[PDB]
């Protein structure tokens, strides 16, 4: 059976805290943006010739414009302010555990925000060869998990150290693995 | 850039189902249960620090319906091309044999946003304690959705996530077992 | 305190 989708995204883009804000009102139909309002532009602009008659109608109403203009303030900075309290300033620090699959895994889990820095070390030396990461995975519930295998078949008496850094713990977390 | 807050809503015909939600850097702030007319925080604890007027989300959707209708007819009524979902199954933390864990079925990159998802323990449908996210918005305007099954890892248990969709030839299964 | 919500224009008929 045939499907039809109307779709609207209202975007608030924040640079340097809320120094620079930019606002996008985007109208789609079936994966096709036909008209948007860009706070950086001032008026409604048509994206495909399907939305050209719409955006000409909408910029005629000068009341509409003035109003949409100030969403960067009324809408954007406003919502930021409200929620910064528990989104921006949200830090949950990682849960790190090292173990070899049956070659060495470093499993950081349940952390926020995204940006994270994992490094493998061999005997106090930074390994840069065998680093094979699964990259930053989204858990979907305001937590992230990532894994970083190290490609080493080792020798007895060596110490491997996984070194996590994150904006929720100042001095780095470090886990150990003796061969 | 630093932070991106997006208010993504939509109305799909002829199913006549809507959704309204707030996205912060990928994660859901909240959505609005259209039926119960409720604001619903992705985490209970958001309730403390902010509030949303559920009705507002309705009056919006009801415009997107009106839009939908005029937009379909302004395009010979051309239907939406399905994109089928890719599905990935994983455990929210390293797995221990008798530690309680949780299975994530992560449905990614698809449209239109409708799926008939099922969990399968040893082959039999599970319903005990499952939670599911609402439809979440991507940069390319395709959809994401998660699902969650809390389980006790055992050596005699094999779970599967049964995603359906109108882009798939046959129902897809992603099988995780220890 | 409250999260303000942006309102889509109704498309001219």
């Amino acid at each position, epitope marked *: 059976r045939p499907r039809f989708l109307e779709l609207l995204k209202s975007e608030c883009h924040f640079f340097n805290g809320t120094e620079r804000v930019r606002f996008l009102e985007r109208y789609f139909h079936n994966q096709e943006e036909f008209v948007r309002f860009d706070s950086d532009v001032g008026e409604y602009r048509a994206v495909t010739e399907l939305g050209r008659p719409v955006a000409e109608s909408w910029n005629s*109403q000068k009341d509409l414009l003035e109003q*949409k203009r100030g969403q960067v303030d009324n809408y954007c900075r406003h919502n930021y*302010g409200v929620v910064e309290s528990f989104t921006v300033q949200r830090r949950v620090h990682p849960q790190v555990t090292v173990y070899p699959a049956k070659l060495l895994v470093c499993s950081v889990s349940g952390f926020y925000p995204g940006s994270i820095e994992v490094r493998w070390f061999r005997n106090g030396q930074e390994e840069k060869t065998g680093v094979v990461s699964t990259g930053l995975i989204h858990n979907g519930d305001w937590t992230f998990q990532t894994l970083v295998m190290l490609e080493t078949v080792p020798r007895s008496g060596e110490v491997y150290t996984c070194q996590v850094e994150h904006p929720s713990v100042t001095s780095p977390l470090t886990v150990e693995w003796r061969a | 850039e630093e932070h991106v807050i997006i208010q993504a809503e939509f109305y799909l015909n002829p199913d006549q189902s809507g959704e309204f939600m707030f996205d912060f850097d990928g994660d859901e702030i909240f959505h609005v249960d259209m039926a119960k007319k409720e604001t619903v925080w992705r985490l209970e604890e958001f309730g403390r620090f902010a509030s949303f007027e559920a009705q507002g989300a309705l*009056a919006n959707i009801a415009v997107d319906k009106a839009n939908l209708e005029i937009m379909t007819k302004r395009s010979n009524y051309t239907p939406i091309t399905n994109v089928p979902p890719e599905v990935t199954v994983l455990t929210n933390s390293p797995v221990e044999l008798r530690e309680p864990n949780v299975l994530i079925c992560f449905i990614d990159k698809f449209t239109p946003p409708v799926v008939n998802v099922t969990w399968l323990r040893n082959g039999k449908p599970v319903t005990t304690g499952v939670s599911e996210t609402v439809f979440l918005p991507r940069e390319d305007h395709l959809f994401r959705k998660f699902h969650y099954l809390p389980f006790l890892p055992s050596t005699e248990d094999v779970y599967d996530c049964r995603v359906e969709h109108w882009g798939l030839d046959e129902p897809l299964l992603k099988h995780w077992e220890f | 305190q409250h999260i303000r919500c942006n*309102i889509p224009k109704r498309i001219s008929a």
Partner: T-cell receptor, first 111, second 113 residues
Framework: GITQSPKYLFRKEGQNVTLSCEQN?????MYWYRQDPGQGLRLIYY???????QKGDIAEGYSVSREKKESFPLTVTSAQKNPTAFYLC?????????????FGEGSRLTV | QSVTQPDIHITVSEGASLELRCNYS??????LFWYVQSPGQGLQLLLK??????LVQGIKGFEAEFKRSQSSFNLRKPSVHWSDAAEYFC????????????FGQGTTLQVKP
């Protein structure tokens, strides 16, 4: 633009008078306020879309229903010795806004 | 969310200058309106202010200024008129946001020759 009536509705006690409010401005949301002298207008009930409606500040003993997008009638139960005041009705649309409020001429109730 | 009109009754001469004053509960970017009501009837919108321009005009040569710093949105006329005697109401677009307006208790105004 909004027509309330009748303008003056003197009424017995324990009687459930219902104040009618119609609008052909094609507005989406619709409101009732009661103006008690010296104080501002106080919000009674308002409906943002058809068939939904939510309490304002002084909502005890009033009820309203929104079956039609054009009609929002306020029923004054003998709830309180509220009643003897002046009732006001307004509407507004959402396209971009959040449109300004538009006001009916209002009606005086008595007892 | 909250508005307050400090003058309860302002008297003034025909031809003089008018300034009904009105203050607002702290808000950043609130929406403000001035309404006027002749006895027995409804309110006309005199003028509004969402954002941007600091000073706006209204009907029957009215004016209002938005002093962010001041938390004040005061109504003005340079040359009042006899017609203008009614109750004036100040109202704020409330609070993240409808739709619903909050009114100040309203300052009434009579004018003499």
């Amino acid at each position: 633009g909004i027509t309330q009536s009748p303008k003056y509705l003197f009424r017995k006690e324990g009687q459930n008078v219902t104040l009618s409010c119609e609008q052909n401005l094609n507005h989406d949301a619709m409101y009732w306020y009661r103006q008690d002298p010296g104080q501002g207008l106080r919000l009674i009930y308002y409906s943002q879309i058809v068939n939904d409606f939510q309490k304002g500040d002084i909502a005890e003993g009033y009820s309203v229903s929104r079956e039609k997008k054009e009609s929002f009638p306020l029923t004054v139960t003998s709830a309180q010795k509220n009643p003897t005041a002046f009732y006001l009705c307004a509407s507004s649309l959402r396209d971009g806004y959040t449109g300004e409020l538009f006001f009916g001429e209002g009606s005086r109730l008595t007892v | 969310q909250s508005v307050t009109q400090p003058d309860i009754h302002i008297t003034v001469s025909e031809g003089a200058s008018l300034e009904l004053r009105c203050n607002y509960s702290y808000g950043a970017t609130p929406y403000l309106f001035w309404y006027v009501q002749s006895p027995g009837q409804g309110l006309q919108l005199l003028l509004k202010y969402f954002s941007g321009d600091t000073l706006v005009q209204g009907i029957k040569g009215f004016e209002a200024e938005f002093k962010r710093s001041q938390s004040s949105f005061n109504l003005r006329k340079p040359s009042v008129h006899w017609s203008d005697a009614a109750e004036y109401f100040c109202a704020v677009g409330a609070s993240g946001n409808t739709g619903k307006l909050i009114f100040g208790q309203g300052t009434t105004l009579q004018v003499k020759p």
